[PDB]
């Protein structure tokens, strides 16, 4: 799910950037260190809103490092997954263990046990697929997945998906 979250960061600036345009460098650091990053506490951070209106407090010089620590408050759109949520995505990889669905910046794993009994794994077909008398699942196919669990690390997030329940599967 996508949220507009008010986040704060502690940036460090090397002494080589102490000039009239120091604020510009801090904005670049925020755009290069925040955007595209994954944080378990808040989830993926996609975009930073109000680029011009970023508030920067006075920097503090570290004793033995010489760099300045800047606390930057900004508004950014984030994607934090949750178990029990229903999301849509496209299958990107397949194997005996299970196929993976691309939900935004996250990859959902559908284990062989979680998928219905009817689905069977066949690798003779190129590419490999999960086939059921009704439908067939393969790369680039759109699948509706239910997140059954999420493990959020400080710098990474992984989740598992299930299509056992009704109204979940090929779209």
């Amino acid at each position: 799910m996508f949220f507009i979250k008010d986040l704060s960061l502690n940036i460090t600036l090397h002494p080589s950037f102490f000039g009239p345009r120091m604020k510009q460098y801090l904005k670049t650091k925020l755009l290069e260190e925040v955007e595209g990053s994954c944080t378990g506490k808040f989830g993926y951070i996609l975009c930073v809103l109000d680029y011009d209106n970023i508030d920067i407090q006075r920097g503090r010089i570290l004793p033995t490092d010489g760099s300045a620590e800047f606390n930057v408050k900004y508004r950014a759109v984030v994607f934090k997954p949750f178990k029990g949520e229903v999301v849509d995505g496209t299958v990107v990889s397949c194997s005996q263990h299970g196929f993976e669905v691309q939900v935004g910046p996250m990859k959902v794993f559908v284990t062989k046990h979680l998928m219905p009994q009817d689905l069977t794994f066949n690798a003779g077909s190129n590419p490999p697929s999960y086939q059921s008398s009704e439908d067939v699942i393969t790369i680039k196919s759109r699948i509706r997945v239910k997140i059954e669990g999420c493990i959020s690390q400080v710098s990474s997030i992984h989740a598992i998906g299930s299509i056992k329940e009704d109204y979940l599967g090929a779209i």
């Binding site: 090397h14 002494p15 080589s16 102490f18 000039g19 006075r58 503090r60 010089i61 004793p63 033995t64 010489g66």
Partner: peptide, 28 residues
Amino acid sequence: RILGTRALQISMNAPVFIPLVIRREDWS
């Protein structure tokens, strides 16, 4: 600490023009 702070900053390839304020109340 300002004298050592700027000395380290200069040694780390910092431009030379001491834009620092002592946070005792902040004073420049």
